[PDB]
Subunit: 150 residues, 12 copies
């Protein structure tokens, strides 16, 4: 792939992720409800901004962002699933953390690609998002009792 | 129908509308770009909050909100379409207004349904979101040079 | 009358009331000057906002608000009179209170009217305005040494 | 039986509830201490404001609120009890929720009453308080690992 | 004439202008709706403060402001007209600017008169209001495509 | 007694006092209504804070605060009484002041006791609350036309 | 006089006035205590700033402000007197008003003198302080039941 | 002496100190102008508040604060002198610090006294103001190149 | 050229661009006046800050920024021209966009250069500014009805 | 000359002054660096606003402001010079003050000119700007150890 | 010992405590991660402030605070240990609580120490920190499921 | 070495630098006391945040930060020394700058290292810290009268 394609792919991913954050936020139950319920609100807003920025950066480089659920569904690498069976807090966090891991890894690809193609601006955006993802990964893993790269 | 079904249907609608708002805002062009670009950010946040509140009111009455793009696409009455052909700001606003008119009319049904079933709380929520939609409809129509209900 | 006419009649009353608030505010004298001087500023802003909201709700339901002193003068049920003879703080308060009671009473009609006509949004607006007027009526009557409905 | 009586009964209830929230707040222990400790502070202020509003709405419709612990004790339907045995976070939350459910249910009666009696303003206040109680009920039940209408 | 008469004449003018601002604000339609709708709100507040100031300055020099729509209508030099025939945005702004021009010019007379009279305080007030009017006039004319003194 | 007993006795007093403050706030009438009505809101919050702090200081030194209206009623030295007869603003303030003087005097004992006993921290708290009470006592007496120490 | 001398005379006056404001602020008693007590705090700050500004303006035009109580006492035209026999709220306000009047009249002289001397800057300062004093004079008079120039 | 006398004595000193601070503030020159000019504004406000607090504490304990420059001059231990000769920033600071040392030492007496007298509240006030003075003394000394107790 | 030279060249450009932004800001006319007038204010401040940061980064790497209009005029690559003829909002916008495009392109060189030189800090500054210019370029093009890369 | 010409001349002056403030800000060294570095940031913003205001006042009276560095250079009376040989803090401040003195003096002219011409508004602007310049002149002079008019 | 020695010993302790707070903050894991992670940030800041205040109070009484890790390590009574083995949230909290009890107990000594020495200021300092420590000890113990005094 | 090692080494350096900043802050004396005293508080906060970020970054890449003074002392390259003899402000600043220079140079290494290994996130962090260090280096050097790279 090329930058435009990489970027649009993230537009799709980010839209799926965001809905996933909402699912966790609405369905969670357990002693950590209060704290994690608010934390999801924070994630939602943060990833919603990554999303608009990625989309806007694409537009700025002459691209055209996907902009319908159908397109997002067709393009995303992030997986989603309806909430049927109830799920443990940890189960939900594990799904959150997994998606973060996916985004971290894809961003890594975009980062190197962008660097090789000499799109310095997109490169730096991706880096900054990664930085954050990494910190979240460390935090959600500690919540789950695990080491970050564990 | 029933309140729970009504509300869930709106969670689906709201998620489609919200992406539609982003589409407009990303793709718009013309002399009204700056002002309308920002207006869409406002709409996005507002509808996004209506969405969270409808979902949370459903949860509170014992329901289970849809929570994946697939479910939203499967259940929404709001229509969406990929942005292929360039459209006019007015064309874009006309799409927005149409969707607002759809929501208005559906809420009106929810308003009576919820009334008929005696759920005073859900009833008042819908009324307050309706009040806002009506004001937006007046403003967007004025933007387009039209009377609100014309 | 119908919703549109009721609302426009209130646009007229609200514009008269607002000027009346300024009158008291400018002409008042007595030991309570400071406090009441400030309270009127607050009433003025609140009533001015009800007024804009009533007019915008009208506009939203397809109406056309009166918008000239002459029309307000011609349609208001609220009475006004030039300040000639000096008047006491209590006399001023009594005028204020009476106007409040008129608004209350008229709002109550609009409330029945809109309930019967099914305009849930306007119904709620008026109810919220009434809620406030009732509270002011209690407070100004208490200032005057009276019971609210007494 | 009547709105005034209904309202005053809630002034009593609200006073008992508020002290119960402090009890929880003071005596809780457990891993959820920090979070729930602060959440109680928020409940305390919120119910304290409901209380002042109900009492002020009462005064405004010509009533006279109870205003001594003795009166509150004599009229409350909300139950209280000295903290002797050390209870569980969950036990404390279960008392809190139980009380919320009681308020919910009684407000529902008041809604209905006020509705039959024509007091639109009091009707709307109660509805809004209900909306909030319902949300809390959803949240505290999630905390306890239960569904709201559990 | 005299300062007192001048000032009171402005209280009348200011009140008619303020209502005229609301008319434009309520009835405007066209692509500039968003922006101008908000700009009128700003004008409304500004002129409403000039109004209270003028009236309070009059009161301070021992005068008695007019304080009824009737008085305002009887003394205003500013003209008003019911909105019957739907007007262009430009037509509305042209009415605004014309009124601004009228206030400018009358203030100029009050500055002279006040000057001659030796009421330094009133003189400075009027100057400061004129400074603002002049800036508006430049802005609204630019909006209309014209030079300020054009 | 002992610090712990002293402290819990204040929790009881503080709870009665706070309800008394609401009584005054609700039932007051007269020309000083607006000002005193808000002053009471301030007293309510302040004393409400002294109360949580005394209780928490108790908890911190190993004590167990009373936490039910029944307990408060059984232990308070502050007196309360249903509002039956209409009373004077001065009468109300005189009740307020009398209660402040009681608290002042009891804290004085606590301040003494507490120092006997070596509890520096509790000593300092009480001193700071006293400082405040003393100031209120000066102001309310001035309001009443009296010197502070009567 | 001469601008420098005039300004330094006001540094003196302003210092006396400011302490007078504290006197009233400290010794007042009566039903208007809360309100006037706070108003005096407001006056104190304002006049304290006029003071600093006058002194700094003098410094800026090459002068040297008085800067000791002794110099203030020796130069002030504003009169002060120890509080021995108690006074009424009205008596205190009357003293306040009288001093305001004195400052108004002296500023008027400085306004002329500063004008005669071409010190446009000092001229404008004085006018702005005069505007405020005039307003205060109207308000305190209204508090006293009098017309401003009465 | 007695607490009342001690307190009043400080009202006098504080008033002379405050003017002194202005003096330094107005007349200073040198490279440290901007910084010290602003620091004096801070000291002015701070001591001004100590002053009002001392006075009000006096009032609260049944005293009567001095409240005229004449009284202040008559009772102060703090020394003042017109600014004739050019002084140094260091000279000015040295005067400031000296005055600070005086207040510190006198508070120390007020402190022992209040202790002995059992006026816990006054005692604590003084200790807090002392704390602040001590810090200032440390900082101004450091500015001057000296150790604090140097 | 080298980092220092590149930076200094940008201090000159930035200074010319900033005055160009004020020219547009002052001279524009047309229906988009209010909105573009304000947007120019935003650009002015933003570019103004890039400028001070570029200058300060130069100073930090041991350079010496140009600091007179003469030097700016002598070194700038950005073109300026007196406003003689009345241009269209579009013409003005086009001039703005073309300058943005020039800055974009030159920053790109500096990015590369700063890179070849291994000045990581400067490299990142430039990238960040570029990111913003790119966004601006997208927005003003959209305003003009064009795609970003033309 | 005439108002327009005077104003435009100031546009040119103000533009040179603003760049000179940056030069000082950038090149300054010495113990006063932190404080003066920040003061210049304040001067830069202030004068930059005077500049925009002068320009907009010109536009408002029918003028056309210079708007290119070339025109600024061709019309300014304020002198600039490239920084080659280092210069003391004092030398820098001396340059600053000299320029302030020039603006002070020219404004004085404009002040009288505009008075001659009857442009009250422009006249008041200039006066207010002059008031600020005078105070700065006092402060910078004090910093340099001199009297304001020395 | 003496107050200066006592204080300095606290400087060392406070610095060790602070680092330990970070250790906990960085290494914690488990479901309470979010909440405790933030809580540690708060303690870090609070204790860091006590630290500077103790140091500055020492400097103010003529002392010389330790100011190097070496000194802190040499003087502290608080114990620290590298995080090797994996610890429980509870274990971590237990370590925190233990250190808090140590500080509490040492402050108690400093309280008596400064009291016999008659340093009222230092005495009050310590008291206020103690107050806070005691509250924290209650909270962390409840978190651990324990009563405060163990 | 490797990123982990590098980062941990900075954790150690940052903690030593932070304590050094407090030393300077506490011990400085001279005319610049006020300004630099505050500047160090700024540096202390800044560096304390760099420190927490570095540590969290480490943790996030799977590392384990040093977390005891002992470890810091053992690993830091930043030197520290007890304050025995009085030193000049300049001497203090020179120690500060030297440390800044050290961190700058070490970060440059980290920058290189982090890049060879391609840890883009850590690389950008270091770059951003460097940017700030460089600026501080330019400013403290100017303060010392030197050029940044000397
Ligand atoms: Fe966006
Ligand atoms: Fe939510
Ligand atoms: Fe509006
Ligand atoms: Fe209330
Ligand atoms: Fe007013
Ligand atoms: Fe609490
Ligand atoms: Fe000052
Ligand atoms: Fe006071
Ligand atoms: Fe700068
Ligand atoms: Fe502008
Ligand atoms: Fe400090
Ligand atoms: Fe952290």
């Amino acid at each position: 792939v090329d930058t435009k394609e990489f970027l649009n792919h993230q537009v799709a991913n980010l839209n799926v992720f965001t809905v996933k954050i909402h699912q966790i936020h609405w369905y969670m139950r357990g002693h950590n409800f209060f704290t994690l319920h608010e934390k999801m609100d924070d994630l939602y807003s943060e990833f919603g901004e990554q999303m608009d920025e990625v989309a806007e950066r694409l537009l700025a480089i002459g691209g055209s962002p996907f902009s319908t659920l159908k397109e997002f569904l067709e393009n995303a690498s992030v997986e989603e699933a309806p909430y049927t069976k109830p799920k443990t807090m940890d189960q939900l966090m594990e799904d959150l953390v997994g998606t973060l891991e996916l985004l971290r890894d894809e961003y890594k690809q975009g980062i190197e690609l962008t660097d090789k193609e000499g799109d310095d601006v997109t490169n730096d955006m991706l880096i900054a998002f990664k930085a954050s993802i990494d910190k979240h990964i460390w935090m959600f893993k500690a919540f789950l009792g695990k080491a970050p790269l564990e």
